[PDB]
Design a binder for these strands. Structure first.
Ligand SMILES: Nc1ncnc2c1ncn2[C@@H]1O[C@H](COP(=O)(O)OP(=O)(O)O)[C@@H](O)[C@H]1O
Ligand SMILES: [Mg+2]
Ligand SMILES: [Zn+2]
Length: 669
RNA sequence: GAUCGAUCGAUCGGCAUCGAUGCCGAUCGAUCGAUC
């Protein structure tokens, strides 16, 4: 098998003494093997007749499966029962029967949180060792911190029997929210108090050997200047001005619906302003329901078109103009398909009047993004130096990931590249998402052998998944906190690797330099903490734990009183009566449906998605689901305005949990 | 293997109010229930 290195034995030494240790070491050095050695030493120290129980908390399903496989192939030779519980595990052989029948359990923290809050697992005393992978996640409300809250509530006050030894496997404590070394040390002490850790054991003696396994790449900042002559921006800004003039002509009070004063086209401030204006335009009352519906539908269309124009302007500055033009054309084609209206056809004609010159200015070699030119130059130079380079180019959004893939594929200069996509799971309003087997299939094809040369990921390829060692870590306008910096920089650990930060905004380079200074502060604070006496640090973390427990035990009132007044759900686009709250049945607190035949005449089905039934509204109301034996349609509260019956207020709600009303359970009879 | 609905958590950017609170957009992770 494997032979433990000297620094791997130095990192496991404080934890093999029985002390709660935070093992901070760079990515790719073998912290999983350190945890394996610690668990092997822990399970062997119990006398005959007694047995230890180790739990390993992983926060992701791929990481959970990988750690379960590793622990099973490593420990089932000794005769230990290794198991794993997750969300994909079938609801059989209950958890209290699994934990009691195994020695090593690979868990996700939410499963243990659920089993502790429901009373299945009464105490954490059934375990003798807890190993949190990526323990820097122990923070405000993370499930790691819920497990540690249970641990500390058992420790302080209600002193029950023995408590397990806690060990973390982070790579960066993340002093973030601090501005100097003292605040960084304070945050680090708070982190060791959250995990009840007294040692921050790092590699100090065998550092010449650790540097031969992992390599720290060289950071290079690339600040580019935005294009001076932007005619695409000119045309889209004229279209936005026309739409805004129409909306102001039909509303007359747009400048008082939001407090955004200085808003420019193509910014996030304008997006906030248009979202606020769209939300304020839905809550509109007047003693004329036809006029109210007409005004609200027209303002909905105007605000949606303005938001789409702003989205295209934001897309066109990080990618090609062809990408924003395709975004706008797809939006207009999909908005024509539902049903065209006088206002909507006027807007469509206004867009199509400028569509040809937009196509002409978008298909121009001179009007190309300078950021993309610098990216092409960097890729060309790197792949001319070493033609077997592999890149882990980091992107912020999924649309930009697809844009960069389509640009790399259609670039005559980047013919040596074979781009691969890696987005996160979970559907969105525009993208579908990548499942777990798709991510696994793409991650195995991206290696030094072939079948994939460059991976275009979005914040999913930097935390816990296993990727090949890259030689190029280009960050396409991608800056976060110090943890994200150390994580993305740690993706390329091959010898002689670079990490480029390409940006066109003076202030992002400053953010990354602040992150570097914060990493320096973090290292200095860890080194300063490692010199304290263990008793003084234990007293400090005990005082911190007592203070935080006192603060935490004073927040136990997060529950309002549910309302029972009758309220009507109207459409959000046309503001037509959809249904009443008295007809809304909820099945299992998650499947809010409508009971009645009057609602069946209000929606049209096109599983089958249900939309409004007005002349030209076609607003998405909900979807058909399949229960045990039923095919009832469920609705979404984010598609309706809630008007009171007695009063006339029309409050808006984002999710059903914000809407407090008398939710009657669904009954099939 | 492919989804649906609901919920939780973390991160970044932006906005409003008085460093804090609240909100919006984007990104990621996980959990409960149901279906093919
Ligand atoms: N003693 C060792 N000898 C050889 N290879 C090792 C040794 N320890 C660790 N490794 C390798 O280093 C890699 C580290 O992977 P992993 O533990 O997932 O990342 P990290 O250490 O950053 O958490 C493993 O794939 C393992 O094969
Ligand atoms: Mg790891
Ligand atoms: Zn409608």
């Amino acid at each position: 098998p494997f032979k433990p290195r000297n620094y791997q034995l130095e990192l496991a030494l404080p934890a093999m003494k029985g002390k709660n240790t935070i093992i901070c070491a760079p990515t790719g050095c073998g912290k999983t093997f350190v945890s394996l050695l610690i668990c092997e030493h822990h399970l062997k120290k119990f006398p005959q007749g007694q047995k230890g129980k180790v739990v390993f908390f992983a926060n992701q399903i791929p990481v959970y499966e990988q750690q379960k496989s590793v622990f099973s192939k490593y420990f089932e030779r000794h005769g230990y029962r290794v198991t794993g519980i997750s969300g994909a595990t079938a609801e059989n052989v209950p958890v209290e029967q699994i934990v009691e029948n195994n020695d090593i359990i690979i868990l996700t923290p939410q499963i243990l949180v659920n089993n502790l809050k429901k009373g299945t697992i009464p105490s954490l005393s059934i375990f003798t060792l807890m190993i949190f992978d990526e323990c820097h996640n122990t923070s405000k409300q993370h499930p790691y911190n819920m497990i540690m809250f249970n641990y500390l509530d058992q420790k302080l006050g209600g002193s029950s029997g023995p408590l397990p030894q806690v060990i973390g496997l982070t790579a960066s404590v993340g002093v973030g929210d601090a501005k100097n070394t003292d605040e960084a040390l304070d945050y680090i002490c708070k982190l060791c108090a959250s995990l009840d850790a007294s040692v921050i054991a790092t590699v100090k003696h065998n550092l010449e050997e650790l540097e031969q396994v992992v390599y720290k790449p060289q950071k290079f900042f690339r600040k580019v200047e935005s294009r001076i002559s932007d005619k695409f921006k000119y045309i889209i800004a004229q279209l936005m001005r026309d739409t805004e003039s129409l909306a102001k002509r039909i509303c007359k009070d747009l400048e008082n619906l939001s407090q955004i004063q200085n808003r420019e086209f193509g910014t996030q401030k304008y997006e906030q302003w248009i979202v606020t204006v769209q939300k304020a335009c839905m809550v509109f009352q007047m003693p004329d329901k036809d006029e109210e519906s007409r005004i609200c539908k027209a303002l909905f269309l105007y605000t949606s078109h303005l938001r789409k124009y702003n989205d295209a302007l934001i897309i066109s500055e990080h990618a090609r103009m062809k990408d924003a033009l395709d975004y706008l054309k797809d939006f207009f084609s999909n908005v024509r398909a539902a049903g065209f209206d006088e206002i909507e056809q006027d807007l469509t004609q206004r867009f199509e009047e400028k569509l040809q010159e937009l196509e002409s200015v978008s298909r121009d070699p001179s009007n190309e993004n300078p950021k993309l030119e610098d990216l092409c130059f960097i890729l060309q130079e790197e792949y001319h130096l070493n033609p077997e380079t592999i890149t882990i180019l980091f992107v912020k959004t999924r649309a930009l990931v697809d844009a960069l893939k389509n640009w790399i594929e259609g670039n005559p200069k980047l013919s040596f590249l074979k781009p691969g996509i890696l987005t996160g799971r979970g559907k969105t309003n525009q993208n579908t998402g990548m499942t777990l087997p798709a991510q696994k299939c793409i991650l195995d094809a991206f290696k030094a052998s072939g079948d994939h040369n460059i991976l275009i990921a979005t914040s999913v390829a930097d935390e816990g998944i296993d990727i090949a060692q890259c030689n190029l870590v280009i960050l396409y306008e991608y800056v976060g906190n110090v943890i994200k910096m150390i994580q993305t920089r740690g993706r390329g650990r091959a010898r002689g690797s670079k990490c480029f930060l390409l940006t066109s905004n003076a202030g992002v380079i400053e953010k990354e330099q602040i992150n570097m200074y914060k990493e320096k502060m973090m290292n200095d604070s860890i080194l300063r903490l490692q010199t304290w006496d263990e008793a003084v640090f234990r007293e400090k973390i005990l005082h911190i734990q007592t203070h935080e427990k006192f603060i935490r035990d004073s927040q136990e009132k997060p529950k309002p009183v549910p309302d029972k007044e009758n309220k009507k759900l109207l459409c959000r686009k046309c503001k037509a009566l959809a249904c009443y709250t008295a007809d809304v049945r909820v099945i299992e607190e998650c499947h809010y449906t409508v009971l009645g035949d009057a609602f069946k005449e209000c929606f049209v089905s096109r599983r089958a998605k249900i939309f409004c039934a007005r002349q030209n509204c076609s607003h998405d109301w909900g979807i058909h689901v399949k229960y045990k034996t039923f095919e009832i349609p469920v609705i979404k509260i984010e598609s309706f305005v809630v008007e009171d019956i007695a009063t006339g207020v029309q409050t808006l709600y984002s999710k059903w949990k914000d809407f407090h009303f008398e939710k009657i359970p669904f009954d099939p009879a």
